[PDB]
Structures are given as C-alpha cells and as structure tokens.
Design a protein around this ligand. Structure first.
Ligand SMILES: Nc1nc2c(ncn2[C@@H]2O[C@@H]3COP(=O)(O)O[C@H]4[C@@H](O)[C@H](n5cnc6c(=O)[nH]c(N)nc65)O[C@@H]4COP(=O)(O)O[C@H]3[C@H]2O)c(=O)[nH]1
Ligand SMILES: Nc1nc2c(ncn2[C@@H]2O[C@@H]3COP(=O)(O)O[C@H]4[C@@H](O)[C@H](n5cnc6c(=O)[nH]c(N)nc65)O[C@@H]4COP(=O)(O)O[C@H]3[C@H]2O)c(=O)[nH]1
Ligand SMILES: Nc1nc2c(ncn2[C@@H]2O[C@@H]3COP(=O)(O)O[C@H]4[C@@H](O)[C@H](n5cnc6c(=O)[nH]c(N)nc65)O[C@@H]4COP(=O)(O)O[C@H]3[C@H]2O)c(=O)[nH]1
Ligand SMILES: Nc1nc2c(ncn2[C@@H]2O[C@@H]3COP(=O)(O)O[C@H]4[C@@H](O)[C@H](n5cnc6c(=O)[nH]c(N)nc65)O[C@@H]4COP(=O)(O)O[C@H]3[C@H]2O)c(=O)[nH]1
Ligand SMILES: Nc1nc2c(ncn2[C@@H]2O[C@@H]3COP(=O)(O)O[C@H]4[C@@H](O)[C@H](n5cnc6c(=O)[nH]c(N)nc65)O[C@@H]4COP(=O)(O)O[C@H]3[C@H]2O)c(=O)[nH]1
Ligand code: BEF
Ligand code: BEF
Ligand SMILES: [Mg+2]
Ligand SMILES: [Mg+2]
Ligand SMILES: [Mg+2]
Lengths: 441, 458
C-alpha cells in the first residue's frame, strides 16, 4: 500500500523493521548508510522514509537536510527513528525538516497509525503533482488557537507571536466560523475541559470548506489510544503536553510550509485554466472569455457609447437526441451547429459556448432591431437545411429557440442583459419552439 | 470526519445507527422517508448515504435509482441496509447502483471498515471533482458525464484456481473482454497495460492475493486501478484486511454471476468517471488559439480575423487599423540578463498592452519580439493616437524583473497602418506597418511612425 525506505547502520535494526512493515503489506527497500540512502531516494521516489540518526560518515540530520534541499525528494515525508532521546537532538531533527522523531524502541501501534496518516495525506498531494505534470517558506501565516486553558493558550500565542500571527478563541462555536476565514493552521487542545477537541476537529474535516486545513493537536502523552484516534480522524500532527516552545515552532513551520506548497499546486492549476480561452468540444470561445469581454463592452455602453446586443441560443429537444442516438452524435450536432453559427455572423461578433446546450453571440455596436434580424437569419439557417449528421438518420430535425437583448444605457449590467435574453429563450420555448423572441426594458 | 446521511422509516433504527456513527466521530444527518431523503442529499451533498429499502411510499430502490440519475448526487456512494436477505433483492439493489448491500443486523466492524474504505477513495475523486466544478463555474470546462457507463471493459482475472477463473471469465464474456492470468509475476506486467479492472482471488493457494494487491497499490503506475477481491465469506478478519490494503470491492465465494456482473459494472463506471475528470482538467489546458507565454491570441488567430475585417472594409464598411510593435534592443536584454528575464519582460509588456486598449481591439503575439494590435472601426489618425498612448506607457515607468528585485527600462518602436480602398489586402496592410517600424527604428527608437497607402501617378 506504500513504498517505504528504511535506513539504519545496524543490520539487525533494518531486518526487524522490514519484517514488521512487510507483515502489514508495505513494499520495503533498505539502505545501510547516508550516501546510498540519498541515491535510492533520488532514484526510486519512496512514499515514506524511515531514518536512523547515528551512523558512520554522513549522519541522519545531514541526510535529512539534503533530502529537503533537493526538489525531487523535498516532498517525501521523513521519520527519524533513533536511540537518541535528548531534547536537543529532537529539536535539531524537527528543525531539519522531519515529520516526526521517534525514540527507540518504538511503539508499533503508533508507528502504523502514523504511517497510515501520512499515506492518507499523500494521496491528495500526489494527484495534484500529476495534474501539474500535464502542462517556498513556513514563516508568517495566521494561527488560530482553540484552547480553554487561558495560561497555556497564552504561551503558545507568545511563542508563535515572534514569527507568525496568532489568534486565540475558546468558544468552539465561533472557532468554526473563524476557521472558515484566512487561517493557515489550527492548533487544538485535545485535552480541553469544556468541549471535545477531537470532535471539534472531526467537524472541520467533515465540512467541505475546511477539510484541507491543517490541524495540530495538543495531546496527553500518557494516553496512547487518544493519540491514535486523533491521527485517525485526520489531525496533521500531534504535540505532547506540556508544550515545548521550540518543538512547537518547528512543527508549525513544517505544516505551514507543506500547506503552502499544496496551495501553490492548486493555484498554478487554476491560473492555467484561466489562460485557456476556447471550449474544447466546439473550438469557439468559452463562457469565461465571453463574460470578460461582455463586461468591458457593456460598461463602455453605459457610459455613453456603442450599444451591445446579445443572442442567447438554446438547442431544442437536445436530450431526446442524446437519449435516442447517444452522446457521441450529440457532440456532433453541437460541433456542426457551432460551425454554422460562426460562419453566419460577422467576425467582429463573438460567438461562444455558454452552457451544455446553450450558445451566446455578442454583437458590438448593434441595437435591438438589427439583433432580431440577425437572430431570425440564424434561426432559418439551422432549420432550413438539415445537418450532415442527420443525413442517414431519418429521425433528426434540428431547430433552435433564440432570446435577444440589448443594452439600455446607464444602469444596465451584463447580468441583467443575459437575464433578459433568458426570459426571451423561456418565452420562445413556451410559444412552440423554433422561434425568436426579443425582450426590452 | 465524514458527513453521513442515514435513511430509515423506523426511528429506533435511525437513532441506533446515528449513535454508533457519532461515537466514531462522523457528522450524521437523518431522514424518515424517500422524498425528504432526496431533498437533503441534493441540498447537503453528504459523503455517504446509508439507506433502508422497505419504506412506505417511495422505497429504497427507487430512491437509489433517482440518486444515480441526478448529476448532482450521482457521485455519492450508497449503501443499502435492509432486513431483506433474499438474493433477488440483493441483485436488484446492486443493479440499481448501490456500492454495497448489507443485511440487518449489521456487523459493525465491517460497516466501519467499509465506510473508511469509501472515504479513502473519495479523497482523490473529491479533489478532482472540486477542481472540475471550479472550472465549470469559472466558465471554461463543459461536459456531460451522463455518457459514462460500465459496459465493455477489459477485466484482468488474477486467480490460481483455473476452474474458478473460467467460470468467472465465462460470465463476463457477453458484456466485457476478460483475460486470465495465473502467474502473479506476469499479472503485475499485464496490470500495467490497458486494463480497466483486476479481479483477484484472495483465497489463492499458490500466492497471497492480498499481498499481490498491496504490490499494485504500492506501485505508482497502477495505484488508481480498481481491484475486486474474491474472499471466503466465513473469514471476517481477512475481508477487513482486504478493505484496509485498498481493495475497491469484495465478492464472496461461491461466486454469484449476477452479483458479479452488477458489481463489475459499478467499478468500471467509477473508473471511467475518474478518467473523465482527469481528461477534462487536462484537455481544457490545451492551447489552440492563444500564445502560451503571454496569454494573448497567436498569429494564426489574428490573421484569420484580420482577413475577414479587411475584406469587409474593402467592400465598403468599417475601416480597420493595425499597430505593429517591436521591442527595442530585446537581444541585449536576453544576452545580458538571460532568456528567463526576457520572458518576463514580454509577459509584463503583454499585460500593459492588453489593459491600455479597448476590449474590442485584438492584441496579439505576432513574432518573437513583435506584437500586433488590430483596431476595428478605426482610421489612421485615431490609430496614431492610440499608438502614442501605448508608447508612453511602456517608456513612462520601468519594468519589474528578477523576482521583483531589479528594475529595467524598456522602449518600443511602433508602426501604424490603416485600410485604404477597394484593392487593399491584409498583406499590404502589414507590410505598410513593417515600413513604419523600420522608419521608427531609424529615427532613434521609441517612436511611432504611421504610413498611409499610395497609388502611383499612373
Ligand atoms: N463610453 C465610455 N467608457 C469609458 C470612458 N472612460 C472609461 N470608460 C470605460 O471604463 C473602462 C476603464 O477606463 P480606463 O480606466 O480609462 O482604462 C481604459 C483606457 O486606459 C484605455 N482606453 C480605451 N479607450 C480610450 C480612449 O479613448 N482614450 C484613452 N486615453 N484611453 C482609452 O483602455 C482602457 C480600457 O478600456 P475599456 O476596456 O473600454 O474599459 C474602459 C471603458 O469601458 C469614457 O469616457 N466613455
Ligand atoms: N455585427 C453585425 N451586424 C449585423 C449583422 N447582420 C446584420 N447586421 C446589421 O444589420 C444591418 C442590416 O442588415 P440586413 O438587414 O441583412 O441588410 C444588410 C445586408 O443586406 C447587406 N450586407 C452587409 N454585409 C453583408 C454580408 O456580409 N452578407 C450579405 N449577404 N449581405 C450583407 O447590407 C445591408 C446593410 O448592411 P449594414 O449597413 O452593415 O447594416 C446592417 C448591420 O448593421 C451581423 O452578422 N453582425
Ligand atoms: N458539474 C457537473 N454538472 C453536470 C454534469 N453533467 C450534467 N451536469 C449538470 O446537470 C444538468 C443536466 O445534465 P444532463 O442530464 O447531462 O443533460 C445535459 C446534457 O444532456 C447536455 N449537455 C451538456 N454538456 C454536453 C456535452 O458536452 N455534450 C453533450 N452531448 N451534451 C451535453 O445538455 C443537458 C443540459 O446541460 P447543462 O445545460 O450543462 O445542465 C447540466 C449541468 O449543469 C457534469 O458532468 N458535471
Ligand atoms: N444578410 C446578411 N448576412 C450577413 C450580414 N453580415 C454578415 N452576414 C452573414 O455572415 C457571413 C460572414 O460575414 P463576414 O464574416 O464579415 O465576411 C463577409 C464580408 O467580409 C464580405 N461581404 C459580403 N457581403 C458584403 C457586403 O454587403 N458588404 C460588405 N462590406 N462586406 C460583405 O464577405 C464575407 C462573406 O459574406 P457572406 O458570404 O454573405 O457570409 C456572411 C453572411 O452570410 C448582413 O448584414 N446581412
Ligand atoms: N477601438 C479603439 N478606439 C480608440 C481607442 N482609443 C481611442 N480610440 C478612438 O479615438 C477617438 C478619440 O480618442 P481620444 O483622443 O482618446 O479622446 C477620447 C478620450 O479623451 C475620451 N475617452 C473615451 N473612452 C475613454 C476611456 O476608456 N478612457 C479614457 N481615459 N478616455 C476615454 O473620450 C474621447 C472621445 O472618444 P471616442 O468618441 O470614443 O473617439 C475615440 C475612439 O474612436 C482604443 O483603445 N480602441
Ligand atoms: F543510530 Be540510530 F540513531 F539509533
Ligand atoms: F426497512 Be429496511 F429495508 F430494513
Ligand atoms: Mg546507528
Ligand atoms: Mg445548457
Ligand atoms: Mg423499513
């Protein structure tokens, strides 16, 4: 279910861990030193890396620094597994970019809960990296604090305050609202006294708008069953009470960093979508592009200047087509119709794919009368000679219903102009169909 | 951590189920009949629906049909939970689109394993839906997933027991294209090709069905491939394990053929649904008519439009003007600061151009360092004025570069032209602008030069 790379200088250690992991059905690979481990990671792209710290030559903290400083491996979660228990070493570990730091001998139940947690988050990131494939820092950023322990809430807020923008909130009902705004990370108290920390977190995950929002849980270290539960409901990371400030800073950074990379992918994918100007099926311009143009045209119209007209065209009985002859022939009806349209209207006009079975034509410098004439021309055109696709199907007979509209001086808006044409379409369909109906103020 | 909608006509049943579910931290909502249930689902978009079958009025099978026939709710996995145990009813349930069919009183351990399984798949499909739905709302993506089905479909049967694989392949034969494979080592290879679904024998004798499935999930190339496990029904712990390693659906031995059909249909339709989303988000990113770097229209599109505009002009009708803009010393830039910053100069310039010109105008990337603006219904005087305006904008304030850390001065030279009588052509128009540009660069640079058409004395 995941490819895990195990690194450790004592073979007894590697063999043991390998056994436990392959017993839960992971594909395990191994390495006995730093250089080898870097090479394997670069080459094989494991889902997770489990890493000893003390080793001859290159040690785990360097290996781990190097993993994060290379763009290829940067995304791979690292877990340090080490005989070291000192706090100094723990902090050096997390500061150097590790997702967690586990002291030998490890709790198996915990390790698995944690591996499962990391693979669950890695699903969404990996699919985004694929989508981008077809075509950053952790300081600053706003951190909401949901604790009803005033004093402990204040130290967390004090510590974060130096490099971030912390905000406290004890009322959980309000914390659901604030969570919905521009928040980068939520810190929750799992051991709260006036509400259930985990339940509140579950609520955020369940809700669509906040499901990707990172959550960091403060948990009682002597309560394993509740930590496991937290990882299972969807917590990004766990902090033990009492709260180490340095550890806290390091884990917050890490999460805000990974969060920002995932928004960076989501934002690049939206940006590219925004540049795309055509409709793929039909090769006309898309709705987005038309509305952008319609906005500038209508504005210029209202400030005195060229009136603009709009035609809204809806293909009649377009389902019966798709139902009877299948969607493949439906796509052909739309493709042909698109070409008839484009070629029966001047090049300064702007024909586009508005919706599933709807098309819009924008006619600059055109008042309502000319627009009704243009529409009637187009109508007769589709109803006048059959479609090439209906040739051998004695069942097709493609007609359209058209709604026409024109700007009405200052005060008017694109939304009102398209809504007026929708009233036209509506009226054309109630008359019988295959009809043009205009609609003034 | 998931929103679950529970539907049942006996309140005792709803309360109990609600309790179990809220106790494992799901957000639970409820409904006492069909109509209400349809309404809530349409409105709240639950992650999962748990559904009684026998209810006064509209029953669960109809409710479930309607859920699948509506595009809004189509994607929600439905689990039927029912006092009915008859095989007929089970098959009618799966054929109407349900993900599973559980007979009361339900095994809780199984229910939870199953809910967790569904929420885990729904993460990737949900993210792709979310990107797509954004795309449709923003006005780029169109499409109709209603054209998706689960028939046809290449089914890879990975079984050791030859006799069972043949009975399986026998039954799939009329609606699909099945292919048997007993060597697991080879089945890993075949899995990598054009396969729509893998059927594995969990109770195999010469290899570990589950292990083999884990191997597919582990490997990046096959991780989304649907897998369907044949499992011993009297072994719950191995079913749960199966769902946990990532099996899409479970079939009990001995294999009911109709159940087999129904469930295979569902899994293929699902796989196809996912591919449809991936391919929308990909195909929409392709770039027919615009320039990739700048986002302006490309030369091909411009000339097509410039032909129709100019023709209409020559037959009496609106004059058209053209601006031809050439960035000054654009090599020295590329040479000094590298082509990466050269690309940023063009990208910024493109945005200064597009925003200082009316929407009815048509700005485009003409050549390497050249741009053209087409101005319908515009004579030469107004075009010269527009040109001068644009010039002063680029020269008037410096350009940001090197990650917003360096400032750079950029001038342009512009050539201006306008249609001129019944024998004019686009070719002639652009060549008149070329002369403009050449003259502007000779004068010094950073200048606008217009050129009118001239007939000879005779
Ligand atoms: N009827 C009318 N509408 C007006 C007038 N002034 C502004 N608008 C409208 O408001 C938008 C913004 O004007 P801008 O800020 O000057 O930004 C303008 C301006 O920078 C430039 N531009 C367009 N036409 C002219 C012009 O005739 N003279 C000058 N100097 N600049 C123009 O292009 C930009 C965008 O033009 P648009 O896309 O059309 O979008 C224009 C236009 O729709 C006006 O006097 N009459
Ligand atoms: N943007 C835009 N406006 C349109 C369109 N169709 C008609 N109009 C407007 O409607 C007016 C009258 O069109 P008409 O009644 O067909 O009477 C038209 C038509 O009979 C003829 N005509 C002009 N261009 C063409 C053409 O390309 N093809 C044909 N067959 N006749 C044309 O000249 C007459 C007067 O032309 P105009 O003075 O331009 O005045 C035209 C024009 O302003 C169109 O597709 N796009
Ligand atoms: N997010 C999302 N929403 C969806 C999807 N499919 C349908 N819908 C929504 O449900 C409405 C009806 O879909 P339909 O039953 O397929 O009935 C549709 C369909 O039969 C047809 N249509 C729309 N797009 C296409 C297309 O690309 N090709 C063909 N052949 N037909 C299309 O026109 C009818 C009306 O389409 P719309 O006006 O778009 O109105 C659509 C749309 O808003 C989808 O895949 N994703
Ligand atoms: N009844 C009518 N139909 C109109 C009108 N305007 C546009 N159309 C229709 O839309 C088509 C495209 O016009 P175009 O793209 O500007 O490309 C046009 C245009 O550039 C030119 N053209 C044709 N007739 C005239 C005309 O009367 N005056 C002018 N100035 N140009 C014309 O030839 C091209 C093709 O003309 P068509 O073969 O007629 O094909 C015309 C015509 O079928 C109009 O005012 N009335
Ligand atoms: N297609 C196109 N044509 C352009 C453009 N810029 C100027 N023109 C043409 O040049 C004429 C006078 O432009 P002006 O010297 O800016 O003198 C303009 C200008 O001072 C002002 N104006 C109109 N719209 C705008 C605007 O959007 N922004 C600004 N800043 N001024 C505007 O009103 C005056 C009269 O404007 P018009 O009567 O429209 O007459 C305009 C128009 O036909 C352009 O970007 N695209
Ligand atoms: F050698 Be490891 F750091 F336990
Ligand atoms: F009423 Be349900 F079908 F058990
Ligand atoms: Mg060691
Ligand atoms: Mg539609
Ligand atoms: Mg009942």
């Amino acid at each position: 279910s995941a490819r895990i790379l195990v690194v450790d200088d004592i073979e007894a250690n590697v063999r043991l861990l390998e056994a436990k992991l392959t017993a839960e059905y992971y594909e395990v690979s191994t390495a006995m030193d730093g250089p080898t481990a870097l090479a394997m990671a670069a080459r094989d792209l494991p889902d997770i890396i489990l890493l000893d710290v003390m080793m001859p030559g290159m040690d785990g903290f360097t290996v781990c620094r190097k993993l994060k400083d290379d763009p290829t491996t940067r995304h791979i979660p690292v877990v340090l597994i080490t005989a070291l228990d000192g706090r100094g070493d723990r902090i050096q570990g997390l500061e150097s970019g590790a997702s967690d730091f586990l002291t030998k001998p490890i709790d198996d139940v915990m390790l698995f809960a944690r591996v499962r947690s990391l693979t669950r988050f890695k699903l969404v990131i990996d699919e985004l990296r694929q989508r981008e494939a077809s075509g950053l820092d952790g300081l600053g950023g706003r951190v909401l604090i949901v604790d009803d322990n005033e004093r402990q809430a204040q130290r967390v807020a004090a510590e974060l305050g130096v490099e971030h923008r912390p905000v406290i909130e004890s009322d959980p009902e309000k914390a659901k609202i604030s969570a919905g705004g521009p928040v980068d990370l939520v810190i929750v108290n799992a051991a709260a006294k006036n509400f259930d920390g985990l339940r509140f977190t579950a609520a955020l995950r369940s809700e669509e708008r906040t499901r990707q929002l990172p959550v960091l849980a403060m948990v009682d270290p002597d309560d394993r069953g509740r930590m496991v539960k937290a990882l299972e409901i969807g917590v990004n990371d766990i902090l033990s009470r009492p709260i180490d400030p340095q550890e806290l800073s390091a884990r917050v950074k890490t999460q805000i960093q990974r969060k920002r990379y995932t928004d960076y992918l989501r934002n690049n994918l939206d940006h590219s979508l925004e540049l795309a100007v055509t409709d793929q099926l039909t090769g006309l311009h898309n709705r987005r592009y038309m509305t952008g143009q319609l906005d500038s045209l209508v504005k210029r119209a209202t400030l005195g200047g060229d009136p603009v007209s709009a035609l809204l065209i809806d293909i009649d009985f377009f389902k019966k087509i798709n139902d009877t002859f299948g969607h493949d022939i439906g796509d052909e009806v739309l493709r042909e119709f698109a070409l008839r349209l484009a070629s029966n209207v001047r090049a300064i006009d702007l024909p586009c794919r508005y919706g599933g079975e709807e098309f819009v034509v924008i006619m600059p410098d055109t008042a309502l009368a000319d627009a009704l004439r243009i529409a009637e021309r187009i109508r007769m055109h589709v109803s006048g000679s059959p479609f090439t696709v209906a040739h051998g199907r004695e069942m097709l007979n493609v007609t359209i219903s058209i709604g026409v509209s024109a700007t009405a001086g200052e005060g008017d808006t694109p939304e009102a102009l398209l809504k007026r044409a929708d009233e036209g379409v509506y009226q054309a369909k109630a008359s019988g169909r295959n009809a043009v109906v205009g609609k003034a103020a």
